[PDB]
Amino acid sequence: SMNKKTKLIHGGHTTDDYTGAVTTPIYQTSTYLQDDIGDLRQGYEYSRTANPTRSSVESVIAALENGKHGFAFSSGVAAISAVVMLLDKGDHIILNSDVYGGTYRALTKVFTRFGIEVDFVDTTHTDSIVQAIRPTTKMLFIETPSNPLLRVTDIKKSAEIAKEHGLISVVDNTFMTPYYQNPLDLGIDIVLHSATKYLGGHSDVVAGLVATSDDKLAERLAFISNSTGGILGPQDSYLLVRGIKTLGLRMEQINRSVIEIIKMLQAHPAVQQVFHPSIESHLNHDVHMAQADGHTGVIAFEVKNTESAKQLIKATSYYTLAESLGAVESLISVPALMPADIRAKEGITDGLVRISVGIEDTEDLVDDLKQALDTL
Amino acid sequence: SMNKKTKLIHGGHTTDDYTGAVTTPIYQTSTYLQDDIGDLRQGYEYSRTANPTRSSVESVIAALENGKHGFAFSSGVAAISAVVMLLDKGDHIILNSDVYGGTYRALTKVFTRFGIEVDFVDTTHTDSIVQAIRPTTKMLFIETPSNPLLRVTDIKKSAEIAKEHGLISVVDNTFMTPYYQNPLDLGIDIVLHSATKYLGGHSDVVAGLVATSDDKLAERLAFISNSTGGILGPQDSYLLVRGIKTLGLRMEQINRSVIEIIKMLQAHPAVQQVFHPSIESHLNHDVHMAQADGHTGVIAFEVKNTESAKQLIKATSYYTLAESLGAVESLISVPALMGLVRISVGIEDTEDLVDDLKQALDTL
Amino acid sequence: SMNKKTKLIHGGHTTDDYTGAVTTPIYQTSTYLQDDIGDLRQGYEYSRTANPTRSSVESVIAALENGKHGFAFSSGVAAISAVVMLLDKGDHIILNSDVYGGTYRALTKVFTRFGIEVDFVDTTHTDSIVQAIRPTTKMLFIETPSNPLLRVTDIKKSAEIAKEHGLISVVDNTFMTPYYQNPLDLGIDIVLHSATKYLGGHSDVVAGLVATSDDKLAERLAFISNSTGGILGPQDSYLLVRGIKTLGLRMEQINRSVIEIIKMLQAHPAVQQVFHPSIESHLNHDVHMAQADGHTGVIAFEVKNTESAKQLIKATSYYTLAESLGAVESLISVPALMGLVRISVGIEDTEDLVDDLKQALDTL
Amino acid sequence: SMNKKTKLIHGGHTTDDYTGAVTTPIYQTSTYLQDDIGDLRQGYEYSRTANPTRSSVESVIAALENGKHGFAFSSGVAAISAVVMLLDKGDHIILNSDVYGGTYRALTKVFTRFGIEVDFVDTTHTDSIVQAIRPTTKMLFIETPSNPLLRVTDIKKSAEIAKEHGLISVVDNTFMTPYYQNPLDLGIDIVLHSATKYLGGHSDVVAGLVATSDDKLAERLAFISNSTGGILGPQDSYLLVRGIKTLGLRMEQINRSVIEIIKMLQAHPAVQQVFHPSIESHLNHDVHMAQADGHTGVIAFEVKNTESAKQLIKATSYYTLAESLGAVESLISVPALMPADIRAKEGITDGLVRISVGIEDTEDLVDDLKQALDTL
């Protein structure tokens, strides 16, 4: 019963019971000696099946999401990939139309070849999920807020919709992190993250994390992980644990700057509109406040055209033009350039700019972006 | 032009063109700065899609297997699963009946749920491969030698059948390594490895490696890997590059010990049978010699019962009771429990490994 | 131009100009290819003399301390020993009497054997520094605040004395970090850190960092380091760069908890005294506020006897009984045994650390 | 009582007693939890004083050199630096005139300022050591074979000379490695290595290793290491252990190529002379065979002038022009360009070329260097 900032330091198991080392040892090892045949010395026999450094980060994400079983994968895509392989051929899964672009690509071009049929639904309306549910629908996949336009979906209702129809509810909590949003506490079966983003938070790990409280769903995830082998390595597991330590402090510095930056974007004439769940005029803004304690650092705002966005990027000094988000350094991107009907259903327009607020000084970030907008 | 031991040191790109560093830099990084929107400074944009350290080890395995493209995965099992995902629902795969247990598990328990069926066949007689071909068969997947009995399958003839019948041929070359056997040179489309074993060589990396010369197949593997993200990390990529450097020396010490160990086992009163492709009476022995320039370090032999096998392990001093194979240290196991005994010959002193196993067998 | 939190993210060179990678590549390498004999492709020839990952963290500490040159050592003790080796036999050093125990050991037990003598002086009264100056005195070395009582020494006035008397002034800025106190801006010649503590921040790196603006001193430190080889490795260099990124956020959470923890300790019946430079009755409190923009996370308080102190540690839940300080997790110790108690405030929840320490004190 | 190749795999302690992991865990940690105050859980309290990954490589070098105590330092220079700090001001140490250049620089320009007086002696004649021994001489420092001209010194005699006069005998065994030469078995007190070279052997670690069998000399080295802090990190300790595993196989492939390469250099008219202890006409060649089981991979040979050496380097394809030696890749250097009286006493002339034989194919290395010499 510790507070969130305390949970990030002592939640789970990140110490060495053997030597007392206050950080998780990095087990660069493949196999483990057995004193007697079949008798494992500490539960370990082969690192693909289980590795102590990986089990440590798996116990952390489980503790942060108030779950019971954690799983670490080589990438957030590998985590999503392992989750959908819970379904069989002829099975059916519903997602929000505005999922992360890589998620759309994986389910439409990879997993449809295996007999999994996919339906996309603007989940901002809860009952619209029920329109697309079939007697073969087994999974409801929610990504709130979405990438990169931050559409909010009612998690607590989607869980009830999933629970009623015998559906496996999944939430992609990458943008909110366990520090501000806990889908497992709202009835969801499985929560997953792209740990590449906020959790690692230092632009130096590609990883995915999955957590659940259901036993039999966990034994199925462990079976898929051990049989498809998309496991996170020990070195990356350790850097994940290390980065998670400062998640609360990083999110709070990010949230402070998000406040000041939004107030500047909404008052700058060179900006057409701003997209963020903290805005009262934003769609489903009251749903977000009911299910989340804070806000993501991804902000979307549209200038007039793509060429103005390229000029705006070249005018800044602290915003790094690159992919990914949630890092200590602020990142800037043009989602349209980094099919057209799906891109429009994701909210991506020309002149749409996505920023990821870092942990630099607030006034420095506001005045840098504002001075850049003055040139348009 | 470049001999084998030289190719292990200089094959592929394992140096830094920037600073001139003689080893591959470890790029613990997720993303890369772009000078202009879509203008990649060195071709890198996101580490899942491409990472310079991973591209280094990927260029090594393609060079060592005489392939055009290489792919590094987070485990050998992940390399297999990416290859199997080349197919659609309804497709069939033909495999050797004694295929690796993890491959059996992944195909029967996972990929059959997606309509991909597998047909187990004694591939030591190539006629059995043809008779099991269905109109929906799309892939031939073989290991040679297999585990743990080391059964040899004709690679060249398997490549001809897959070619004549329009199948994607796959060879798991883990046990032999690129230092002794190159399936791509024998007509196979895709060769893969559990780099966890010999390639890494030091019992400290879990990894898979895939190589092919087909552009359309590599483009499909690249798309599959980017969309399922079973990516090998940079630090493991580096240790893989580092371990491969001594692959030729390790294999050669392993093969010298295998000769003396088999000679001891064949004569010991407590041993009833020895399994290894280097024995002239082994099935398809000449087939192996025609497709391989050396031997694997995995040896299986039989003793009376599992009790004598367990007492054998405790009586040894230099054989480590653990899973896995292909490491610098010698490994021993009883496959039915994890009287057949399987050993992995390491790079310890040859007479030390001979005397130590013999004195332990003397206690039975 | 660049504020403090921004300088922690973008100060120094912590990106790859080659591929555009946003984090410093880890150069696990020993040597570098030369295009021509003596022609360094990027200025690197041998990793002991210079390593690009180490040069990254070296450029960070110089930027954060407003210095011209930075030096990364394998421990804070190694950073101190390189600085002390600037002197010759017969030279003298003036230090605060309560200097770090490892510094006491290194100077009295090691460097006196080479003729370098040390004069311990209560530097909280700057007059005592002048009266201990000999004709052979060459260096003034101070820590502020000190361990474990947190005694404050006037940095500006110490810099004037060293300047007026021709001494090399050194300040151990470990406890305050570059985020709150910059001795080089106050006239000190050399500032050093045990990066093992706050800079690394995560209890997983042993390192020392040195910064100076003097070219002739930096040239001498560079020669000393290349000829004694107390070099920080590349992997530790990288984790140092990574940990420093959150230094501002960690210190600020630590300082918020320090305020509430001191308020609780000052009122608890079981506490007889609290030591911290943030108390207005602390000796040289206004001196600290004039040379520092914040506070350290080390707090010392006194309870009845060592028994009550030991029972305090067992009664807590979030305080880790271990050596060291400045980590994300809270650390507690009894200095006389490794009733004075020293705690290191971490980044846990403020009320959690307040309530947990109070309920433990309630059991005494 | 295992053979050398077996000793490199199982000598010392490189496994995890806790989990059974067959490789040493990497303890990226600074401090260790204590269950009771002052009571260490497994002997660890602070990583500068002791770290489990470092203790593992320290137990390896001790086992390989038949010593009892090992010490790992941040560089071979830091190892030598810690060894000479065993002496006091006014103390006296004898070295061979042709020591490694960095050793000469460290003792002449650093440790002379602390009262340590240094004497250089052509140790190829044993009694010449006795000419320079004073009532304040405390240490005899031998580097056989030398860098880069490979002058051989009688180890067994130098030990007797040191033992008679109450001297601390030290041998720099970098070039021979513990696989071929074991100074501790010949009476020497302290053996040290630049583990950067052959031991690591993969051009990716800078490290130094020290070993001794005397208890009180070890307690003094541990005191200096803990008080001057030039400790090797855990990641570099691990890569050292990993590289040491293949030391025997790498040395034997190197020795095979050294044989074939020397026979080519001695028969090429473009080569004036060749320097290697395996040559019968080489100085003290019979001393080497009496104290060493094999040969180093460093070979020195002189072409006519410096300009011919630069042309020879540009003609090769498998020889890497860089510093350091003992790596899997073959390295080539010109020691004169990478005072004049000391350089001449070290045997360094113009046109002198130093090669470090790698583990590439023998015929490839011979024909590559030979074809290059044909252009001169």
Automatic annotation (TrEMBL), chains B, C:
Keyword Manganese applies: no
Organism domain of life: Bacteria
One Gene Ontology term from the biological process aspect of the record: cysteine biosynthetic process via cystathionine
GO cellular component, one term: cytoplasm
InterPro entries, alphabetized: Cys/Met-Metab_PyrdxlP-dep_enz, Cys_met_metab_PP, PyrdxlP-dep_Trfase, PyrdxlP-dep_Trfase_major, PyrdxlP-dep_Trfase_small
Keywords: Pyridoxal phosphate
GO molecular function ontology, one term from the record: cystathionine gamma-synthase activity
List of residues that carry N6-(pyridoxal phosphate)lysine: K197
Pfam families (UniProt xref): Cys_Met_Meta_PP (PF01053)
Listed cofactors: pyridoxal 5'-phosphate
Family as reported in the entry's similarity comment: Belongs to the trans-sulfuration enzymes family.
Protein name: Cystathionine gamma-synthase homolog
The encoding gene: yrhB
